[PDB]
Design an enzyme around this catalytic site. Structure first.
Site, PDB file in Angstrom:
ATOM      1  N   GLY A   1     -26.503 -11.653  22.242  1.00 18.81           N
ATOM      2  CA  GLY A   1     -26.691 -11.255  20.855  1.00 18.81           C
ATOM      3  C   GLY A   1     -25.545 -10.341  20.418  1.00 18.81           C
ATOM      4  O   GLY A   1     -24.675  -9.995  21.236  1.00 18.81           O
ATOM      5  N   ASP A   2     -25.533  -9.960  19.143  1.00 17.04           N
ATOM      6  CA  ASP A   2     -24.463  -9.110  18.594  1.00 17.04           C
ATOM      7  C   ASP A   2     -23.069  -9.674  18.858  1.00 17.04           C
ATOM      8  O   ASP A   2     -22.106  -8.919  19.001  1.00 17.04           O
ATOM      9  CB  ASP A   2     -24.553  -7.693  19.166  1.00 17.04           C
ATOM     10  CG  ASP A   2     -25.896  -7.039  18.872  1.00 17.04           C
ATOM     11  OD1 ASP A   2     -26.324  -7.058  17.689  1.00 17.04           O
ATOM     12  OD2 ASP A   2     -26.536  -6.536  19.827  1.00 17.04           O
TER      13      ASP A   2
ATOM     14  N   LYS B   1     -21.876 -12.816  14.625  1.00 22.43           N
ATOM     15  CA  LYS B   1     -21.979 -14.021  13.820  1.00 22.43           C
ATOM     16  C   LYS B   1     -21.639 -13.835  12.334  1.00 22.43           C
ATOM     17  O   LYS B   1     -21.006 -14.703  11.724  1.00 22.43           O
ATOM     18  CB  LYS B   1     -23.375 -14.587  13.961  1.00 22.43           C
ATOM     19  CG  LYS B   1     -23.793 -14.678  15.414  1.00 22.43           C
ATOM     20  CD  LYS B   1     -24.979 -15.634  15.576  1.00 22.43           C
ATOM     21  CE  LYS B   1     -26.311 -14.890  15.510  1.00 22.43           C
ATOM     22  NZ  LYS B   1     -27.364 -15.723  14.871  1.00 22.43           N
TER      23      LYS B   1
ATOM     24  N   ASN C   1     -36.764 -10.322  14.673  1.00 15.62           N
ATOM     25  CA  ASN C   1     -35.882  -9.738  15.690  1.00 15.62           C
ATOM     26  C   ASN C   1     -34.500 -10.410  15.698  1.00 15.62           C
ATOM     27  O   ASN C   1     -33.542  -9.899  16.283  1.00 15.62           O
ATOM     28  CB  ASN C   1     -36.524  -9.766  17.102  1.00 15.62           C
ATOM     29  CG  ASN C   1     -37.440 -10.985  17.346  1.00 15.62           C
ATOM     30  OD1 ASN C   1     -37.343 -12.033  16.703  1.00 15.62           O
ATOM     31  ND2 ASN C   1     -38.332 -10.831  18.306  1.00 15.62           N
TER      32      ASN C   1
ATOM     33  N   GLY D   1     -31.221 -12.728  13.599  1.00 17.15           N
ATOM     34  CA  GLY D   1     -30.301 -12.518  12.494  1.00 17.15           C
ATOM     35  C   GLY D   1     -29.384 -11.318  12.679  1.00 17.15           C
ATOM     36  O   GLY D   1     -28.896 -11.051  13.784  1.00 17.15           O
ATOM     37  N   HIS D   2     -29.169 -10.582  11.589  1.00 21.71           N
ATOM     38  CA  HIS D   2     -28.180  -9.507  11.542  1.00 21.71           C
ATOM     39  C   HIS D   2     -28.184  -8.807  10.191  1.00 21.71           C
ATOM     40  O   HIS D   2     -28.896  -9.217   9.276  1.00 21.71           O
ATOM     41  CB  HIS D   2     -26.784 -10.064  11.826  1.00 21.71           C
ATOM     42  CG  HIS D   2     -26.367 -11.164  10.912  1.00 21.71           C
ATOM     43  ND1 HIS D   2     -27.161 -11.627   9.878  1.00 21.71           N
ATOM     44  CD2 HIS D   2     -25.239 -11.917  10.875  1.00 21.71           C
ATOM     45  CE1 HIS D   2     -26.537 -12.602   9.250  1.00 21.71           C
ATOM     46  NE2 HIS D   2     -25.367 -12.800   9.834  1.00 21.71           N
TER      47      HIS D   2
ATOM     48  N   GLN E   1     -30.367 -16.274  17.624  1.00 20.98           N
ATOM     49  CA  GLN E   1     -30.416 -15.367  18.774  1.00 20.98           C
ATOM     50  C   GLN E   1     -29.510 -15.745  19.963  1.00 20.98           C
ATOM     51  O   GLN E   1     -29.172 -16.904  20.150  1.00 20.98           O
ATOM     52  CB  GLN E   1     -31.870 -15.181  19.221  1.00 20.98           C
ATOM     53  CG  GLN E   1     -32.851 -15.162  18.055  1.00 20.98           C
ATOM     54  CD  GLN E   1     -34.279 -14.826  18.451  1.00 20.98           C
ATOM     55  OE1 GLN E   1     -34.628 -13.655  18.616  1.00 20.98           O
ATOM     56  NE2 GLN E   1     -35.114 -15.853  18.585  1.00 20.98           N
TER      57      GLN E   1
ATOM     58  N   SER F   1     -10.766 -13.645  15.847  1.00 23.70           N
ATOM     59  CA  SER F   1     -10.887 -12.605  14.866  1.00 23.70           C
ATOM     60  C   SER F   1     -10.202 -11.393  15.441  1.00 23.70           C
ATOM     61  O   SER F   1     -10.553 -10.935  16.528  1.00 23.70           O
ATOM     62  CB  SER F   1     -12.345 -12.310  14.557  1.00 23.70           C
ATOM     63  OG  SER F   1     -12.471 -11.110  13.809  1.00 23.70           O
TER      64      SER F   1
END
Ligand SMILES: [Cl-]
Ligand SMILES: [Cl-]
Ligand SMILES: [Cl-]
Ligand SMILES: [Cl-]
Lengths: 408, 408, 408, 408
Positions: free
Chosen positions: A13-14, A17, A39, A41-42, A212, A397
Site C-alpha cells: 500500500g501507499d 497511486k 480502508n 484508496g487514498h 489495496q 516519477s
C-alpha cells in the site's frame, strides 16, 4: 471483446497511486472501484485542497468520468455521504452497486466493543457478508422494510449484543438514518453490472482502480497481516462482475523502496539511519497518528511475486527521488530461507532473510523529466529493478509534481 | 445594569438541556457558549434531522439569534467547520472569540500517543492554554505568522515529540490547514467581549448556555472525574467577560433521576432492575458506543449543592415520565458519611452512602400538559424535590414532545 | 374542530408582512402557503442576510416549523429549487403538494413570446391549470411519463408554438430537467391535504400565510389590475383543502398609509410632495427596478372593505413612523361617486374621488415601545383607523426593528 | 519566451467551443478568460448536468486547472457567485483579477431604465470603465470604502438617476451586498498579471479562452451589431497583460455553416427550407427564448478574414453532420460588392451579396471517427474550406459525442 485497463499497488500500500491514477483518468469514460471497505484508496491534494477518496473512485475529480462503486465494495453510507459532500453535484458521475454490502452504525458499535473485550465497522460488515446475514445497498430503496429486517436480526442476535454489552439499536433512530440514506442515495443506486457491461459493449474506455496493496491480499499476502479481501487484478474483475477476457492493460504501481504501516513480515525493513532517512524524505508518516511508517529497501522477490499475481504489462516507479544522495542503495534479489537461497515468496515470510545486491547511489534524480538526463547510476538501478521484476518500467516519477515524470 | 439569563445542567450532564434551551432561544437576541471544548453541548433532533451542537450555541437553529462562542471555549477549527456545514449560511448569526484557544491537529496526535503510552486534542489544547504556550483564534487572521510560530514551538518541543514517537508536523500541511481555516473563518472571527458588552448596553436579550454538568465542574465536581473547566454559572460569566452584576435569571436543568457516563462517585446508582429499567425507558445510551449509562435515583443532596453553587432562580425538571409505573421511587435526602448523617456534598464522595426516602409511584405522567391532571403521587414527588432542593420547579417535561410541558 | 390561524395583507401588497409573520412563526407547528405563483410572498433580511421567500412559507426560517406549499400554489420547480438552496437541509421541514400546478420552462418561453407580440410563466401556467391541460407536482415522481405527455401536448399545440415563433422544446432537454426535478424534489413531495388534516386532528398549531394583497384578489380587487387568484382568507382555506369550520384567528396586516406598484385605480394616491416623502421615508422602492412605488393616504373605505372580505379579528398596523413629522395627515373616510357620498368599494374604483378627514400629525412615534408614550395625536390617528375599519388594532410597529412593537 | 495557446470562435459565436475547450483543458495548468462580460462563454452538459460558464473559464471542470478571470473581464459579483455555486470548492482553482471592472446592481437598474426610455448591466458597467468612473474587483477588499465612494458617485450623478426615474440606491443595502461580496470573494481575488507571468516564467501550460465570436469584435466585426470589446486573439493577450511574444498555438473554432443570433449583416443567410433544416438539425435555438437562430451557408470570405485577424495555426471544424443528406451544399467564395467581385470583408457588409460555389452533399458523416471513412464529397468539402480559409483543418467533429472527432 472490448476491455478494461487495470491499475494496482503491488506492495503493502501507499505505493503512491494518486499521482498516477489521477493523471490517467482524463483518458477514461468509467473509473471503477472493486473491493475492500473504506480502508482502501487514498487522499489527494489538488491545487491546495485535500480530497479523501476512500470509497469513491479517483475519477470523481474528472467530471467527464463516470465512477462506479462495484458489487465487491463494502459501503458505509455515512462515510460515503461525507466523501460526496466534498463535491457539489455527482449525479450522473457516481453510481453505487445495489449489490454492495452495507457497513452501518451497528457494525461500528460491534467493532468497538470487540476491541474493548481484548475504518470502523468494516470487519463486522464483512463478517455479515460472508455469513450472508448482512444487507446490501439496494435495500436502502425500501428503508422501512430494511429497518424491520434489521430489527429482527438484532433480536435474534440479542445474546451477541449482551455479550458485547451494547444495547439493541433504537428502531426510531435506525429508521431515521435509513430514510436519510434513502433520500440522499437513491439517485446513485443502480445495477452496476448491467451498466458496466453496457459500457464495454459500447466500446467505452474503462479503468479499474485496484484499491489495496497486493501484499495485503487475503490469500496471497503476508497472512494474518493482510486485508479481508482479494487485492490482485483478477479480484478486481470479480468485484465488478467482469470476466478474464475483459482484462486490458494492467499497470502495477511500485515505490523505489518499500513501506509497511503495521506489524507483519517485512524482509527488507531497515531499522537504522538509512530507513529513518527514507521515512523523512519520503514523508512516510501516518496522516492520522503522525507515526513514522516502517521503511525498507526495494524487495525484488516480493515485487516479482506480485507482478506475476497481477499479470502486469508495465511498472510505474514512484518516489525515486527519495533515494537521492544515498552513497549506497540495496535491492533484495533473493532470500535465505531454511538454509537455502530461494527466488520466491514463501507462505511464512517471517522466516526469510534478505539477500542484497548493493548498488552505487546518485546525487539527484529529483525533478528530472528526461530519461537521458538521469544519473547513470539511476539508470542502472532502474534497469536492475526491471530485470529482477520481469516487467518493463514505463513510468518514472522524479518528484511529487505531476509534471515530473519520465515515459519509456 | 442590563442582564444575561443563564441555563445550566446541574447533574453529571445529559440533563436534557436541548428541549429546554431550544424552546427558550426564540426569546433571545444572543445565545452564548462560555467554556469547555467540544465534549460539551448536545445533539438535537429537529423534524427528523440530527443536529450536532458541541461547539456552536443552540441558538443557531433560530436564525433570528446571534450566537457567540466566547473567550473561554477551546475551539477545534475542524470540528467547528464540520458543525457549521450543517447550515447553509451563518454569517451574521455566529461569532467566534478572537481570544478562544485553538485545538489543532497536533493536539489530537499528542492526545492519541499519550493514550497509547498508557473529543480528541481537548486535554492537550487546555494544557497549552494553562501553560500559555497555545495559540488563539485571532491568530488565524495571520496564517503564515501562526504557522511559523507553531513550527518554532514544535522544534523547541522536539524531545516531547520523540518521547511520544510522533513526527514533527509538516510545515506545508500546517500552512495549508491554517490558510483554509483563515479563508473559512475570517467572517466569523471578532472581539466577542466588545460585541457582548454592546448587546447588553443596548438592552438586548442575552442567554448564556452553560455547556456542562455542574457535578463535572473542575473545582466543585467529583474530582478526578470531572471536566477541565468551571461548569457553574459564575464560570459562564467569566468565559464571556461578564461581571456578577450582569447575571439575570438562572435556570437549572435537572432530570427526575440521575445518570453518569463514566467512572466516579455515584451515591444513588442503582445496579439492579430498577436502574436497568430507567436506562431503557430513559434511553440513556451512549450514541457512539451503544453502552448503557450508569443510572440512579434522584440525589437531593447533590442537587441542593449544585443549586446553591449556581444560584438557581428555578428548576426545570425533565424525563419525569421515565418513572411511570414504578411501585416505589427513591429520593436520597441525606448521606451516611464517616458514621454521621450529613446534609452536604463532601470532597470525597466515594465515602458516602445514600440515605433514602421511599415514595409511592404513579401509573402515568406521560404526555400530561396540566399540573392538576398529574397523578397525586407525582405532585407529591415534585413537591418533595422542590423542598429538598431549595428551589422552585417552574418547568416539568412529561415526554420528549416539545409540546408536553407544565408551567408553574 | 381544531383550527388554523390566518394572516393576510389587506391592501395592494407590501403591507410589510415579513416582520409580522416571522415573529409569529415561533408559535406554530405548521406554516402554509395557499395560492398564487412566485409573484407572492416577500424577501426578508435576517442578521444581514437577504432571504427570498416567494414560494416557500415564511416558517422555513424557524427549523421547528413544518412548511406546506398547498394544492393552490403554482410552483416553478426552478424557482423553488433556487429558493431551497438558501438552506442547507429542509427535509422534514418543507412539503410540496402533489396537486400543485407546475410552471415549467415552456411557460416562461410562452410568456416572453406573448409580451413580444404586444415571475415569468405564471400566467400561462395558470391558464393551463384552468384549461385542465397543465401538469402537477405529483407527476414529477414519473419523469419519463410526464416528459412523454408534455411532448404529446406540444405536438397537439404546434400551431400555437408557430404563432409564437418559438420552437417545440427539446425532448432530451425536457427529460433531463424533469429527472433533475424528480431527484431533487422527491423527498418533499407528498399529499399535503392528508398531512394538514392530520395536523389539525392532532391539535397542532397551524398558521396560513395569505401571500397577496386583498385588493389584488381576482374577484374582489380592482379588476383588471389584480392577480389571477383569490387572495382573501376563504381563498386561503380553499387552496389548502380546509373548510370554513377550520378558520381560527385572522389577522390583517395594514400599513399606516397605502402603496400600489403598478397602474390601476388608487383613490388616495398623492402625486405631490407628501407622497414623495412617504415613498422616501417608507422606502417604497422596487427592489428590482429601483422605481418609486405609487404612495397615498390611508384608505379607510378600502380597508373596511377588505377587513370584512377577510373576516378580520385584528389589525396589525405597520410603518406608523413613516408619518413622523407630518404637520397634517389624511384619512379617506368615504368617496364621492356618481354625485353621491358612498361608504363602500364599487366595482369601478377609477370613478371615485377620496373624501378626506384631515388630522394633526406628530413629531415622532419612531422606536416607541409603549402605548402610553405615543404622541397623543398618534393615539387619535390609531383610534380613528380602528373606528373606521371596524376592527381592533392589536399590533403597532413603530420601526423596522423587530423589537419595536406595541401590543394592545 | 514561454507561451500561451489561444482558442477563439471565428464566426458570430455559438461555433461550439465547449466540446473543444473542454477536451483541451486536461492538457493545461492555467485556463484564462480575457475580456467581455457575462454575455460571453457558453453552457455545457456533463454526464447529464447543465453547467453555466459565462464568467468562469471552462477549466473549472478540470480540478487540476487553475482558472484566471483577467483584467479585461467585466465581472458581476452576483453572476459570478451564482456560477461558483455549481461547484463545492474552487479555492486554489479560481482567481479573479483585482483590476477587473465590477458590474453591480445599479448597472442593471440603469440598463433597465434605459431600455424603457426607448446580461444586464454590462453596457453601463463598460461605459463606467471607459469613462474611468467605475470600480474594480480589488476595491471589494475594502467594502466600506467602496460603498462610500459609490454613494458619492450616485450623488454627483443624481440628475442622471432622476432622468431615468430610478431612486438613488440605498446605502444600507449597498454596504450589505458589498460586505457579502467581500466575505465570499476575498479568497479568490489576487493580482492576476503577476500570477500569469509567474506561470509562464515557470514554463507552465497556459490556454487563453477567447470568449466571443470574431465577427462580433467591436472594431473588426459587423458594426453596430457587435459586442463592446475586442474579440480577436491579440485582444485576448491584452486583457490578460500578455505580450505578442507570448502567443503560442492559436486554434480557430468554426462551424461547417453559419449562424447569427440577432440582426445585422449576414451575407450567407438562408431564409428558406435549407436554412430551416440547418436550424432544426443543428439545434440552433436560443436556450432562453426558444427562438430559432438565423442560419446560413459557410462564408469563406468572412472565415478567411477572421482567420487572418486571429493568426490561426489551425481550424477546428464543428457540426459537419448537420449537413448530412443535403443534395447540394453552398460555400460563399466571394462577394458581389458595388458592381465588383471582392475577396474581402468590407466595412459595410449589408452591401455585399454572396457568390456561391455549389457542391455535392453526402449521406452521412455522422459519428465517423476515421478520415478515410468519410464520404468522398465530405472530404472534398473539407478540402475546399481549408483552401479558401488559408488554414489547415486539424479537427473535425462528426457529432455531439466527445468521442467523435477526426484528427489531421
Ligand atoms: Cl463539484
Ligand atoms: Cl441554513
Ligand atoms: Cl439551513
Ligand atoms: Cl466541486
Amino acid at each position: 471483446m472490448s476491455k478494461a485497463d487495470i491499475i494496482v499497488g503491488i506492495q503493502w500500500g501507499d505505493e503512491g497511486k494518486g499521482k498516477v491514477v489521477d493523471k490517467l483518468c482524463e483518458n477514461y469514460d468509467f473509473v471503477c472501484r472493486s473491493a475492500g471497505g473504506h480502508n482502501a484508496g487514498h487522499t489527494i491534494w489538488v491545487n491546495g485542497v485535500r480530497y479523501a477518496l476512500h470509497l469513491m473512485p479517483s475519477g470523481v475529480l474528472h467530471p467527464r468520468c463516470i465512477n462506479i462503486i462495484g458489487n465487491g465494495v463494502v459501503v458505509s453510507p455515512e462515510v460515503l455521504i461525507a466523501e460526496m459532500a466534498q463535491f457539489e453535484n455527482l449525479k450522473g458521475r457516481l453510481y453505487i452497486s445495489d449489490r454492495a454490502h452495507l457497513n452501518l452504525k451497528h457494525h461500528s458499535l460491534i467493532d468497538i466493543a470487540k476491541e474493548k473485550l481484548k475504518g470502523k465497522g468494516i470487519g463486522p460488515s464483512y463478517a455479515d457478508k460472508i455469513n450472508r446475514t448482512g444487507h446490501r445497498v439496494g435495500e436502502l430503496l425500501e428503508p422501512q422494510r430494511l429497518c424491520e429486517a434489521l430489527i429482527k436480526d438484532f433480536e435474534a442476535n440479542k445474546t451477541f449484543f449482551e455479550m458485547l454489552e451494547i444495547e439493541i439499536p433504537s428502531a426510531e433512530e435506525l429508521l431515521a438514518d435509513l430514510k436519510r440514506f434513502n433520500e440522499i442515495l437513491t439517485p446513485y443506486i443502480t445495477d452496476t453490472t448491467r451498466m458496466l457491461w453496457k459500457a464495454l459493449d459500447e466500446d467505452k474506455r474503462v479503468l479499474l482502480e485496484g484499491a489495496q496493496g497486493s501484499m495485503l491480499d487475503i490469500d496471497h499476502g503476508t497472512y494474518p497481516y493482510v486485508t479481508s479481501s482479494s487485492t490482485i487484478s483478477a479480484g478486481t474483475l470479480t468485484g465488478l462482475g467482469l470476466n478474464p477476457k475483459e482484462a486490458g492493460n494492467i499497470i502495477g504501481i511500485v515505490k523505489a523502496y518499500a513501506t509497511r504501516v503495521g506489524n507483519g513480515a517485512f524482509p527488507t525493513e531497515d531499522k537504522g539511519e538509512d530507513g529513518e532517512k527514507i521515512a523523512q524524505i519520503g514523508k512516510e508518516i501516518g496522516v492520522s497518528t503522525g507515526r513514522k511508517r516502517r521503511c525498507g529497501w526495494f524487495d525484488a522477490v516480493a515485487v516479482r511475486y506480485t507482478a506475476r499475481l497481477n499479470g502486469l504489462d508495465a511498472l510505474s516507479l514512484m518516489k525515486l527521488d527519495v533515494l537521492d544522495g544515498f552513497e549506497k542503495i540495496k535491492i533484495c534479489r533473493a532470500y535465505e530461507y531454511k538454509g537455502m537461497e530461494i527466488d520466491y515468496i514463501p507462505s511464512d515470510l517471517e522466516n526469510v532473510q534478505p539477500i542484497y545486491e548493493e548498488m552505487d547511489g546518485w546525487d539527484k534524480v529529483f525533478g528530472i523529466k528526461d530519461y537521458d538526463l538521469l544519473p547513470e547510476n539511476a539508470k542502472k538501478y532502474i534497469a536492475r529493478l526491471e530485470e529482477l521484476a520481469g516487467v518493463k518500467v514505463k513510468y518514472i516519477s522524479t518528484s511529487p509534481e505531476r509534471d515530473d515524470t519520465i515515459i519509456l
